[PDB]
Ligand SMILES: Nc1ncnc2c1ncn2[C@@H]1O[C@H](COP(=O)(O)OP(=O)(O)CP(=O)(O)O)[C@@H](O)[C@H]1O
Ligand SMILES: Nc1ncnc2c1ncn2[C@@H]1O[C@H](COP(=O)(O)OP(=O)(O)CP(=O)(O)O)[C@@H](O)[C@H]1O
Ligand SMILES: *[C@H](O)c1c(CO)cnc(C)c1O
């Protein structure tokens with residue numbers, strides 16, 4: 001069985017905890033062949049840590065996509081896309097590929113970006129992985145505060161064409177346990193682990209969606225892939241570490257090097 | 269203890285076998301925290317595999333470097349640099365950092381002002397310099413090298429130009445029954461050998477080699493132990509390389525941890 005080829009269409013996080021860096025590291029950890037088409041470069045100021053986003057030109061974006069498409073990805077993830085034009089093209093390359101899996105991490109103002117996502121990505125998404133704020137934006141419900149709110153959003157997001165939806169609650173929701181809500185159109189599943197240290201969590205969302213993608217490419221069902229991704233990212237969070245006064249990234253290699261973490265799944 | 273922070277200063281190999289892709293993968297495999305400052309983006313034509321190098325703006329290269337230096341690398345590798353400006357800046361950020369280790373992979377293929385720039389700015393700061401047979405000929409001024417004796421000569425010259433340790437890769441380019449690399453520490457030459465493995469799918473082997481050397485140094489191996497371990501690491505990767513298309517196929521970066529170790533024969537020559 002040859003390595004599964006997994007493409008991420010994503011920006012570079014120079015601090016190397018999130019972004020295409022989280023993606024390639026997680027793809028490597030999960031025994032897939034990681035590839036990236038880069039969309040922008042994010043840098044941070046040495047004194048204040050203020051972020052700056054440098055876009056890449058569309059000409060180089062297209063050249064990267066031609067190369068990736070000729071290689072033929074088995075699975076595609078999207079992360080930071082940044083423009084409507086990019087969001088659009090991302091969906092197209094999935095369709096143009098022979099990929100069977102598309103994981104849209106809807107990283108988020110111009111609500112135009114959000115409408116593009118709804119319009120071009122959701123209908124193609126094998127799984128869409130919003131955080132609590134992003135699920136409120138995609139659903140139109142605004143602030144979500146509870147599992148029941150998460151159910152409503154997931155329902156709206158499924159109706160918008162995503163075949164499977166995972167709304168991450170985590171630290172944004174409850175503080176005692178870490179709750180996410182998975183929906184496949186017929187059943188709501190609550191996914192749960194212990195709530196680990198909250199200080200050093202940079203890169204968890206990116207790592208969750210990259211894992212989901214790898215687990216899918218390697219033949220897990222969308223439901224089993226999201227359960228496995230949460231266990232994978234949970235270890236990474238538990239083993240997060242302090243980079244400097246501003247940031248502490250998850251340890252993407254922790255699941256394999258340090259420990260597994262249990263995930264409890266219940267129908268809600 | 270904490271994960272070692274390892275920075276590569278390198279281009280993106282869209283095909284993902286070499287470049288910063290091989291570096292981050294290798295770094296991940298070797299239990300370090302991998303980081304990149306991007307210098308350029310390399311793409312390939314879908315029908316011919318002809319490469320195209322799109323430079324990144326110096327303004328973004330410098331901002332990436334500020335971020336990385338602020339984080340504080342333990343070890344820095346250089347890959348595709350592309351210009352004398354970036355070459356110079358790569359050496360300058362190493363000295364500004366508290367990194368103990370600088371591994372310069374003098375990439376010239378997959379502007380020989382660059383060669384001279386590497387010689388002036390990078391060799392004197394290098395813990396280890398890792399040229400392939402072709403790059404060793406360029407850096408030494410000897411031209412084409414075809415033997416262990418020519419490699420020793422190149423190694424001495426490169427060492428005299430300031431590189432603290434030198435490994436000249438022979439491998440398939442030496443065109444012998446086994447894969448020989450030559451290590452020199454200014455005192456003694458060591459020949460490193462593994463079998464020759466399949467030749468068709470080796471893309472990324474050089475970048476991988478130098479990445480593993482970097483991560484091994486960061487994790488506390490001596491320069492000689494680090495390049496010996498790197499050869500064993502990339503040997504497995506090469507042995508388990510696979511066919512990407514009719515043009516190229518990459519090494520399997522994860523083969524050393526996932527598939528097999530390959531013993532490296534070490535002889536003082
Ligand atoms: N401290 C913690 N303990 C356990 N699980 C956590 C956690 N923090 C977040 N999670 C979980 O991590 C995954 C990612 O969550 P989410 O996307 O909300 O985090 P995030 O936005 O803070 C990280 P990123 O820096 O890439 O954006 C989800 O599975 C969520 O349950
Ligand atoms: N077919 C093969 N079998 C065994 N060892 C090989 C090999 N090809 C290269 N090597 C070894 O791999 C390491 C990398 O060698 P070198 O830098 O010359 O690779 P390369 O130029 O062939 C790949 P790239 O340029 O695409 O990154 C060296 O240790 C060399 O001995
Ligand atoms: C070429 O494949 C290559 C190398 C060494 O071959 C190094 N870096 C990058 C970006 C490449 O594309």
Ligand SMILES: Cc1ncc(CO)c(C=O)c1O
Nearest residue numbers: 011012013018019042080206
């Ligand atoms: C490149 C890139 N992509 C995604 C994210 C957020 O998950 C970040 C930072 O949080 C980033 O820098």
